[PDB]
């Protein structure tokens, strides 16, 4: 995800599915290579203490001046027609200056972005359309015309460009927390399960204190926790032996 040779162009941002693995985030957060590391519903120090229902990495390249548009609730031509985060985003935005990887002395014109669109796109939607845009009130057809445009523009990345006009690689990690049966987890070791005694438990990052006992409740396969009228968890399915 972080060291692949060729990142996607931002109009066609690649999404990778992360699953069935141990995610040590402490190496990512401690590495001073990342210029941005902003988390929107968790602390970057707590990511190891936790599990995630599904995890995705969205990877793309942009200009340093547009990195502010990758935050949730934003506006501007990247947030409008290339890559929109949801206003309730949970995850971490990670970005680093890729001028040693994505800039060429004549310009690395391989990194496109969408320059026109009829209206702004939905959160985590991907616009791949190559149809000719109409700016004027006239209709337009075929390959070109007056007040008509190809909807994609290319970024001129050269290692001569001024500070903020160099390329930056972005990974947005997005996930849903503590609600459901997880398959990505931080590097924590499990203990044995202690029943009938008052204990500080932690199931998949759901920390608490209580007496655990054998339940006659049957959960369906898609359920990991049970709740009370007060929203407190009052039952759980053990993640190693599915009791």
């Amino acid at each position, epitope marked *: 995800v972080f*060291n*692949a*040779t*060729r990142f996607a162009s931002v109009y066609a941002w690649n999404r990778k599915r992360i699953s069935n693995c141990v995610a040590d985030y402490s190496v990512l957060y401690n590495s001073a290579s990342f210029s941005t590391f902003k988390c929107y519903g968790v602390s970057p120090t707590k990511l190891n203490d936790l599990c995630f229902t599904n995890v995705y990495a969205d990877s793309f390249v942009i200009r340093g001046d547009e990195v502010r548009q990758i935050a949730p609730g934003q506006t501007g031509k990247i947030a409008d027609y290339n890559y929109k985060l949801p206003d309730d985003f949970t995850g971490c935005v990670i970005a680093w200056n890729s001028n*040693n990887l994505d800039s060429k002395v004549g310009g*690395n014109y391989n990194y496109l972005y969408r320059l026109f669109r009829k209206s702004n796109l939905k959160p985590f939607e991907r616009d791949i359309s190559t149809e000719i845009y109409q700016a004027g009130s006239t209709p337009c057809n075929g390959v070109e015309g007056f007040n008509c445009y190809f909807p994609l523009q290319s970024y001129g990345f050269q290692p001569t460009n001024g500070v903020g006009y160099q390329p930056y690689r972005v990974v947005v990690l997005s996930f849903e927390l503590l609600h459901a049966p997880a398959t990505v987890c931080g590097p924590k070791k499990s203990t044995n399960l202690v029943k009938n005694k008052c204990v500080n438990f932690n199931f998949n990052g759901l920390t608490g204190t209580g007496v655990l006992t054998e339940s006659n409740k049957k959960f369906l396969p898609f359920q990991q926790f049970g709740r009370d009228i007060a929203d407190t968890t009052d039952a759980v399915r053990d993640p190693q032996t599915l009791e």
Partner: antibody
Amino acid sequence: QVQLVQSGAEVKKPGASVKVSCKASGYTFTGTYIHWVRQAPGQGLEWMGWINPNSGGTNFAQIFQGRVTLTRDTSISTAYMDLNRLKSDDTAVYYCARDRVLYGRSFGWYFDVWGAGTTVTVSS
Amino acid sequence: DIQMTQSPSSLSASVGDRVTITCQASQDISDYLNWYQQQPGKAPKLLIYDASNLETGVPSRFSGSGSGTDFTFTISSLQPEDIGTYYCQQYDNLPTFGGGTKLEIKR
């Protein structure tokens, strides 16, 4: 265990055509370019072209442009090189080689994983 | 095109000798160069990339240096597995190889 497995030795008449194949395994076949490189008997390497296995887009060295055709079957992770109207000095070892998955520059080609090479012999 | 030339077409070197082989591009190539070794009867192997980045798992003796038109590859002390042809390759505009330098053991 990344690998590129090629067709066995090919033997051909002048003016004919040859279909070398390159079965990939151990990595996601769409992730990176596959280059085609050749080597005549007792001589240096010569890059022919590439295919991007995700988009099917191709680029060729000028000597081969209008001669070589590059294709791929993503359902069987196999890239192909077809070379038309063969001349005697097209007698060469033909390699497919992958374009480095990690740590490179975003423009750069490289040749990090190479296939075993397929000898083509073109003669009367 | 970018034409590339390697200065020794072959270079006899003893076990433990230092080997230096120089590759020159016709145009200015900045640092857009790779180096590959071909041992007799095998496909080439990438050793240095981006003119001086040493590849994963290759011996520490191999070095690459220089930028612009003129570049060097070096073996700090030669070992009898290093014997083969060494090729430079530009990547600024369609990946052209150099003519290759054969090493051989001096006797």
